[PDB]
Amino acid sequence: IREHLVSMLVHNKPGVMRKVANLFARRGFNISSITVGESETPGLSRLVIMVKGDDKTIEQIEKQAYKLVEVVKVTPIDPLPENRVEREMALIKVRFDEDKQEIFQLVEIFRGKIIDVSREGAIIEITGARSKVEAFINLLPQKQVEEIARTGIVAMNRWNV
Amino acid sequence: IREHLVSMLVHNKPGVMRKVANLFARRGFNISSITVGESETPGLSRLVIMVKGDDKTIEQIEKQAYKLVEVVKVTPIDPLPENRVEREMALIKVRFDEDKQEIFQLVEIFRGKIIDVSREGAIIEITGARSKVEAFINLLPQKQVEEIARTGIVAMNRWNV
Ligand SMILES: [Mg+2]
Ligand SMILES: [Mg+2]
């Protein structure tokens, strides 16, 4: 009923992602997005998970994650969009068809970056809220999009104001 | 012995990530990084995996992935760094300590973005090659880094030149 966001600090060693995927699958969790990479603490990874569910969802995930010994801190992200930041990044390969200029214009308007060009097309890098990224993707001529590689959402609570 | 990069298109439904994590764990694959999100084809996700291994590594992963019926295309990424693009994104929460100006300068030099500020600190968004992202993170006063949330690597082959 609402998408929820949770950040999670896990001891990083061989076999660990296998474990958290298992726990989430064999608990009936509807995961929409997952991000994973090094954290602020060397030796610990941070995962951001978005899960589609009800208001008991965050408690549930908390309770169940903590049963992996490797799960060392679970941090819910504020449900108020005003209280957090959310970002996604996409790499987009587009072929030109007499429209170099419309495409480059679009990249400029969205503050994207061209990171590869040939006579045939470009690769564009785009970062922003998920709805900026998607709005951008949808504005491209769909027959000309060759490839799209996307991260999930990274999110964090804002500084308290 | 070398890090290898592979892109992979998978049918996206409940239980799917569980499966590919299982196959990779119970095959002895040393996964350094994983990215996942929607692809250019609606209904299919694209995953980018980096795996530390020998020259048989890409074949192996190919052979073994294809045994999940949901794995629908495996694309190795060019091993020549000249032939591909690689990008990572990080969200970084930093506390100020009489050094607003050094920090903002640093963000400008790395073409990062300030996406949250208070009197206490900022959240910085940074995108680039993994060594630009890490060089940036290492340049911050380590006692002042509160939080770091990172995607893995997204990668793609360049247009043929
Ligand atoms: Mg514990
Ligand atoms: Mg098949």
Side-chain angles (χ1 to χ4, degrees), chain B residues 65-69 71-72:
Chain B
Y66 275 132
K67 320 207 150 147
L68 285 194
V69 299
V71 174
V72 331

Side-chain angles (χ1 to χ4, degrees), chain B residues 10 19 24-25 46 49 54 61 71-72 74 109 129 133 150 152 156:
Chain B
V10 318
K19 273 192 161 172
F24 286 20
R46 173 171 303 274
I49 302 166
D54 78 334
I61 278 181
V71 174
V72 331
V74 179
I109 289 153
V133 179
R150 266 222 231 187
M156 197 156 281

